[PDB]
């Protein structure tokens with residue numbers, strides 16, 4: 001009806017049947033080869049897992065259940081006075097494969113509003129943490145401590161049918177999504193608002209709005225940016241470190257809280273969730289070095305120096321993507337729509353033109369075009385979100401949507417423990433020699 | 435000399451050269467095929483990663499740097515008045531590929547004794563946690579909060595050469611190993627010893643002994659069991675969920691603390707680190723149902739019922755192993771040596787004979803023989819370690835040794851971000867159809 005759990009109950013049998021047939025006909029079909037280099041090279045280009053919620057196409061970028069971000073911008077419900085898609089509807093899409101109605105999204109905002117209360121042990125933990133404990137650590141720790149609240153963990157220990165796993169996983173996932181802005185906002189306030197209270201959840205507000213309210217912002221366009229941000233960082237296929245970590249830990253039947261916290265520890269890594277900060281730090285050094293106002297000619301020579309030094313241009317490139325990132329494009333649209341005379345944004349715009357050509361000549365790049373992280377920092381900074389250490393928390397809150405959507409499906413489809421075979425160098429040499 | 439870091443500094447270049455040559459000659463060599471079923475089946479039998487510290491051979495079980503557990507029992511230094519190998523020496527083996535001297539192991543015990551102090555924010559967090567927060571959650575949270583202490587995290591943000599990564603990773607890993615018994619013991623005392631202090635580290639004691647002292651035990655043979663336990667659970671190749679999680683999160687350059695905490699969230703999962711408890715719970719139900727003293731004939735009929743009900747016999751089977759687990763064998767040896775007239779152990783012994791034959795006839799089993807978890811609970815319980823929820827913490831403290839050993843090498847060898855490609859069902863169907 002508007003009850004997601006019932007709609008999902010109807011979808012699951014159909015998907016189980018489809019997969020069962022496909023495995024019966026094509027289980028033994030070879031879809032790729034594993035080389036020595038793939039084993040040493042982090043499984044690069046290895047088809048490794050099934051992940052239903054999103055598929056990253058190298059040339060066009062991300063599709064959410066086969067929908068592009070432009071399609072999502074147009075189709076997904078917006079807040080009444082807003083233009084930006086609500087992350088609620090994105091989650092509905094990832095879970096159901098269907099664009100929700102307005103009423104479905106309204107129902108979901110209300111659900112998450114009612115599940116958001118933190119247990120007091122987690123409030124205490126958060127309030128006692130020192131200011132020098134990184135916000136991503138605080139998040140992960142708190143989410144792990146939330147596992148006390150887990151339906152799945154409790155029911156599993158009492159012996160529960162395999163077929164009922166997804167239901168408890170759904171319940172925990174909805175609970176975690178609900179609580180995450182409260183957790184995230186407590187961290188922000190404890191670190192940068194002298195430990196002031198996060199205030200009330202409003203049952204008539206969407207998730208992003210309750211979040212920006214608890215963060216202590218009121219600017220309507222910041223809420224709009226947050227809706228966009230939370231929508232587009234939500235999922236990036238299954239092979240990224242945070243999706244894969246959530247997937248792997250979850251495959252051992254760790255509850256959503258544990259699986260998500262482990263994902264956060266992966267997103268905290270420099271090579272996964274820190275690029276936003278790296279970009280902003282690089283832009284700041286840029287201005288410092290050549291000046292806050294620059295012609296396109298100087299700017300072109302700086303890139304070259306960067307590269308000759310053997311240093312990357314942050315925010316350009318991607319592991320699998322090979323064209324401009326649609327997550328970048330849509331932030332650009334927001335900017336030139338809402339802050340086009342922003343000096344930092346202008347630099348971001350400038351680099352868009354210049355950097356691509358360079359990286360080409362250099363050769364080594366595969367993808368000479370920008371990723372999402374090239375553009376997120378200047379938007380956030382524009383609206384007073386200046387605490388760069390905190391940025392990966394926003395990413396984390398976003399990424400819950402995609403990874404938990406998929407976790408529900410992994411349990412509904414009965415995906416088993418992920419357990420590849422490892423080899424040593426010595427072992428792999430003898431293997432090859434016979 | 436006796437400085438591990440210097441010895442490891444000498445080993446690394448040689449291994450880099452060996453791998454570089456091997457990739458140049460054999461990078462493009464195919465070592466396996468990926469099928470649709472492997473993607474749906476948790477990468478089962480997929481050669482997925484390089485993991486140097488240990489290799490699980492399906493027929494003989496685990497080798498630590500090519501040494502068996504029997505070899506390890508004989509070669510590895512023991513405590514002076516002891517017979518059981520010290521986990522210190524195991525860690526030395528995994529790190530160096532070499533059996534340490536007595537003096538090397540003594541040096542290592544002293545190193546870990548000096549690094550063990552907890553920061554006060556982690557003591558506070560632990561002391562404030564409620565009793566209904568699972569010990570594995572408490573561990574993971576505390577380890578994550580320890581990331582405040584990370585050398586690697588700090589140095590990376592200041593820009594550090596790739597070539598120096600392993601050194602800071604070593605430092606953090608040694609620090610984490612040191613602190614882990616203190617963390618683990620604080621949890622145990624807060625949960626089951628009314629929050630009494632963990633008392634002092636003794637700089638002349640080995641790690642396991644300081645650990646059993648902080649746990650509040652004095653029985654010499656418990657310390658001996660702990661040495662054995664911590665040695666044999668230390669590593670089980672790279673494809674298990676906790677090793678792989680540590681490996682994946684670590685590949686994003688998450689520090690050892692974050693990587694290990696994420697591993698713990700995976701070990702907390704029922705299908706990875708809970709089998710010990712499942713076994714004990716099953717044995718208890720067993721006695722309850724058929725009686726605490728039984729002939730081998732009744733016992734044989736119970737198994738059958740279990741199986742006809744569509745329920746597993748816990749502690750039998752393995753994902754990759756296909757014969758009796760040497761980790762099982764060596765606990766048996768300890769038992770029939772130290773507690774042979776233990777009623778629970780006798781049941782464990784009885785099941786050894788009977789269960790294998792059953793599982794055979796049933797067919798479905800691949801491995802009809804016992805794994806390590808069949809045997810750990812009765813040993814621990816025998817010595818008063820009766821809090822089953824806590825058992826996976828012991829496993830966790832053990833598993834640090836192997837996963838952190840390998841983390842050092844992954845960073846020394848410059849292993850890149852792990853990033854396989856995922857596919858949807860829909861996508862994988864179209865892929866196959868062309």
Ligand SMILES: CC(C)(COP(=O)(O)OP(=O)(O)OC[C@H]1O[C@@H](n2cnc3c(N)ncnc32)[C@H](O)[C@@H]1OP(=O)(O)O)[C@@H](O)C(=O)NCCC(=O)NCCS
Nearest residue numbers: 275311312313314315316317318319364365366367371373
């Ligand atoms: C995203 C990124 C890590 C992808 O790494 P990758 O898949 O290994 O990249 P490639 O396979 O294209 O690497 C080919 C070469 O181009 C280099 N390269 C890639 N992107 C580059 C960039 N934006 N600037 C400079 N050099 C770059 C690589 O370092 C490598 O050089 P090398 O041969 O000297 O080692 C890489 O493009 C990068 O470092 N970008 C900047 C950081 C960033 O924006 N990250 C966020 C996305 S995860």
Ligand SMILES: CC(C)(COP(=O)(O)OP(=O)(O)OC[C@H]1O[C@@H](n2cnc3c(N)ncnc32)[C@H](O)[C@@H]1OP(=O)(O)O)[C@@H](O)C(=O)NCCC(=O)NCCS
Nearest residue numbers: 709745746747748749750751752753798799800801805807
């Ligand atoms: C360890 C274990 C999970 C391995 O799983 P696996 O690799 O999928 O096992 P297999 O491939 O051998 O499964 C073949 C069949 O034998 C069954 N089986 C395997 N071990 C069994 C056991 N000890 N008792 C009963 N049935 C068992 C499986 O459930 C499966 O039955 P199915 O066809 O009805 O689904 C499995 O042996 C098990 O459940 N053991 C008991 C729990 C345990 O000891 N786990 C700790 C080690 S991780």
Ligand SMILES: O=C([O-])CC(=O)C(=O)O
Nearest residue numbers: 235236239240241319853
């Ligand atoms: O795709 C990746 O590997 C990393 C990333 O950009 C993301 O997860 O959003």
Ligand SMILES: O=C([O-])CC(=O)C(=O)O
Nearest residue numbers: 419669670673674675753
């Ligand atoms: O090997 C596995 O997959 C699980 C396990 O027994 C271990 O990690 O010790």
